[PDB]
Symmetry: none
Subunit: 346 residues, 4 copies
Amino acid sequence: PPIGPTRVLQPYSIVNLPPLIIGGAVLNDIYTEDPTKLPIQDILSIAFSKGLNAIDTSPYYGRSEELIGKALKAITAEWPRERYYICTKAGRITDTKFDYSREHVRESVKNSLRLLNTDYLDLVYMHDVEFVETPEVYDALRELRLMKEEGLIKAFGFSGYPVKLLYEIAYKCAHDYVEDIGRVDAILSYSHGCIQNTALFELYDDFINKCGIKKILNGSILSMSLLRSGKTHAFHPASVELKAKVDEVAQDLKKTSNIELAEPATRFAMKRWLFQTQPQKDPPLKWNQRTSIVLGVSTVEELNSALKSYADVKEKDGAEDEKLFEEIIKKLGSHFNETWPSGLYS
Amino acid sequence: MNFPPIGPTRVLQPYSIVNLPPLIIGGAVLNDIYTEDPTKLPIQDILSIAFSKGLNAIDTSPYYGRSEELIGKALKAITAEWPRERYYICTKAGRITDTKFDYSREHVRESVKNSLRLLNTDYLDLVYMHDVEFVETPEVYDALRELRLMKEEGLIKAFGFSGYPVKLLYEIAYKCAHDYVEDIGRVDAILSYSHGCIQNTALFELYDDFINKCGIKKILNGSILSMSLLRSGKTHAFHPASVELKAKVDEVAQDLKKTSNIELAEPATRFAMKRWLFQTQPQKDPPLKWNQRTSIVLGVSTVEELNSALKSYADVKEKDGAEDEKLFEEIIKKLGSHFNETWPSGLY
Amino acid sequence: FPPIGPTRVLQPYSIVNLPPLIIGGAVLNDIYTEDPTKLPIQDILSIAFSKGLNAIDTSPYYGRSEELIGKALKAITAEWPRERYYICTKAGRITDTKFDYSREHVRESVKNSLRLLNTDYLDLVYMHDVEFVETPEVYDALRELRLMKEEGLIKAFGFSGYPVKLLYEIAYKCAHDYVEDIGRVDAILSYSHGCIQNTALFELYDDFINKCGIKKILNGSILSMSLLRSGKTHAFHPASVELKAKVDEVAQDLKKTSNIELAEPATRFAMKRWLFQTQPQKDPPLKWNQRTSIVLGVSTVEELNSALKSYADVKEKDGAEDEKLFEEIIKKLGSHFNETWPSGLYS
Amino acid sequence: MNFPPIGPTRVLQPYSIVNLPPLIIGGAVLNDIYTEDPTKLPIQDILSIAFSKGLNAIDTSPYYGRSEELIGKALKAITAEWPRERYYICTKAGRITDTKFDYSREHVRESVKNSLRLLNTDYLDLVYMHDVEFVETPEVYDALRELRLMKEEGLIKAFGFSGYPVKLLYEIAYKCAHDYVEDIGRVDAILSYSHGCIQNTALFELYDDFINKCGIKKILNGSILSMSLLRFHPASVELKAKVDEVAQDLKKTSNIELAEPATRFAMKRWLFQTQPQKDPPLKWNQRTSIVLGVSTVEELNSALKSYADVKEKDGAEDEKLFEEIIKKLGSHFNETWPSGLYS
């Protein structure tokens, strides 16, 4: 079942990014090296046809931009540029390297425009803002704001892990820096909108109303594959005890119930974020268009599975779901809402 | 020279409608009410100084008589000194007279292209749907959809609407930001009037919900003297206020003109200026800091009134004002049951 | 998951080295080449081959299957030369109701198969669904396959179909009354009789091998044409309404009660009882009985991997909990366990 | 003087070693034992008539002394009337003397090459590993892997092994079909001897298991008179003495020659009764053959006459004589002797 329109709604608004956005990080070189995978142009074209007509990439994702850029040019006939959204980032070059100077932001965004084979991007985030001093974050945002007025980008924002730093940066943009920056169009938060950490859900009204944000994106709804049986996570930043409590709950759900943690943890992030951030009545729930979730889709399996949990959450009673949700959050008990360190911010 | 500029004498880059100056020249002084021979209103003089003093914004509407026509000429007459990129132009659409309202998307786009013609420019900074309480709300949303279009093409930089009942303004603004987020979205600005003065403060209390809940970028407060009702002067022209409130106000006018030799228009102006442009955000101590999300559209008809306005503004931003609060309260007590009294308007 | 077995054709040659899992080629048809989620045929064949599934089963009855697989095989000649894998196909069924077991047509059909599959020899040819023709015609068609085997056009011959007792009659007759002219068939393909809903094949295994002298037996439709599945996924299945209902009642029971998909324990039950428990075993790792194989479709890597996973589990995990579960499914099935449906002309 | 052929006088198509005829000419007679001067034996005359009566098969071994060469000379002599295609040739490998065996993979290949040379042909229908009980069982399986390849190569059409202890033969064949199904597979035929005869019937009670459990296609029964004891024998002295006592009274109390019931019993019980039977005429089970020892053309016609009596003549009075002979045979019935390394 298609989640939404397969075209960019007019009049244009970055609020119209679809409820599910392709996590374009997955389309890297390990992808083009796996004999099992479809050509990127095919996974992109199927996803688009189901209402996932938007991708999130970054220069930090290696050959993603070029690959996605490569694949985009081939589907021009069925999928011209005006049919989809393109989201990209600047500022994180490597796992350790950061340059937020204004010249680079223009360049990196310029480099992205050539690879993605477009003369405009829908959304550019400054990537992972907790890794730099905060005055450098504002000046970078001043650059993106000028790019937006130039018509090179339609919207600008930033991302990062610690959700209160995000609030402080967004707040100041809309207040103390309202001349130079103004409200940012969108923020991307991750691993704070999931069954083990809901701190994004509690801050949603403060982001929309007090920071004037137009659109909030929730990433890592499985917390970098932590909310998943079988230790799908290798070098997760979470503490050992968090990683072991999640492990515990996952096997205890595969053993007594044959339940894979990822499906109730997916439906929970889907339901609380995309629908319940606004008053609901009874199924069928109404999507809150100020929200989207970014998730990888590297197979048609992964895609129809996301499509099914979205449809399940949107259209089914889910009283049983709520009872399952309480138990998981209960079982995690102590480590619910536990965070880890990221960057220079405590 | 005289007074120093209250702000920049240019449109800040990057462009943002919130950079509309704290005070805006209001074009309704040129109407068929408020004078005859408005061709003899010194608009090209007020315009020349006000721009130099950082009031580089004008606000008008085709409803205000020959206003648009006469601003456009005065604007042309000053081009080499004040090129169009140096100031902001706000106009409106949808009201022809006082009983004939046309909110069709066809009339709106014709109205705007005609505004463009009379004001010698290819683009307008901000356009409102005019006095939304007279039209059925479904029409109001349909008219904002066309302004939303005009903004996306680049014919206008910003869009919004105006009207007397503030609670109806909130309902519409809210609907644009939630139910009609796809095809309308948050409006950039609203113009409220006779709700931000010494006789009616209801607008100040709604400030945070307008900005926060409805996502408005900029709120504009007009008729801070309530279409000259708050003038000590005397009785007033086509004013819908009841006899009582008229009779109460001008009683406080002819009171204030016996007891401390003071004209009601002075403290009323200072009152609106302070409560709206500054105290809508936290304020330590003077110098007070302007909340750039606010503006006042001023009824100025002679250069003397313009400089007087620059006066009351500097005094509110720098003075102590503890003595001003005293007189504010006495005015409001003398209003009493007539404080916050409204009159009907439109269909709402 | 790494390969089920060798990725070559063992020497000396023997039809009993057909791998434990064999690609069912029916689904490699039009509705495949058109599907955008589907890989190209040449790849899914290459991927399955490299995991030890280096055998394809197909049939002129399967539409364009033979042509499409035949092209796909030409494409991967460099990494997968003809000698690296097995080709099995069939003959004698042309449409869903038109059969032709005539010796002349049997030879036409096989020579067509070789053309379509870009090879000069086929590993195995069956006569398709023997129950639809008068038995005498079966043996005359088998004589022709025995001749094509003699002539080296095929490495092995046999027949396929649904009533397992008729399959036994036929194979026994070839090894006895017609020993001079036919002799033991190499192989038979049985289907819907080697699954959790019908084990009749499992019980006749030793008679087929010992009394009839068959060297290799194939079990297909281990989910009974997607009947052993929660999805009510069967197309136009011939099973009675009572059995269909009883199967789906169980399918929804296992979903509600234990969040179990019937097809997983059903697939594990088929693979363990057939590929392993047809010969003595000890504790895991279980030893595959090379006289057996299963024909399963694998049109996606997900299906391939799922298949590979169920094989690895049955082969190396304890399966004590499996056995308790298998018994629950079987008693839940009740009187519908081992129920058949009519097919062809046979009693 | 004639009697019809006992069966086809060509090689049936499709080819199958199950079509080895019910009686096969045993070339062990051309041995250095069993007659002095092998050149005397009228092998050309014996073969000429045998092929015409449908005994279109001969069995030999390098171990049989000059058997192969003289059989090879004789067959080249009749290649006009009998070309290679109309008859079957079987032979053996691995046994060189009464004590020397070479089951080495490379010798097995040399012996077959020599066999093909002597017998003047490019292929052989069947090759046996000879008398397996004398070599360590691992060596047997390796030699059969060689024969399995020579079969794939087309040098031979079928392969098996031979020997005395029948339960060892079951042991090897069962393993070839199960443990070693990948590089050997089921063997085509085995040849047993001295266990399918009036003094020993062990072969008859294993027939079903050889065919059904080992998947063997064809089983041959040799020395139905058990190396002419019933007419350097490894038989115990007591065993031969007891057979004489049974032969003496037979040659006196009824004036019957023990070899003639012993021969008909071996034919009936093996070529016919190994499948269900009823009223004559009897139906030869094609999974069986007997390898005869015939040294004159008379002997050949006598055996062919025995075949027809068992196949037709009632034989109620055959059964009575059979079961009296096993009665008279006493405790020695089913007795065996030692052979090689087995047990």
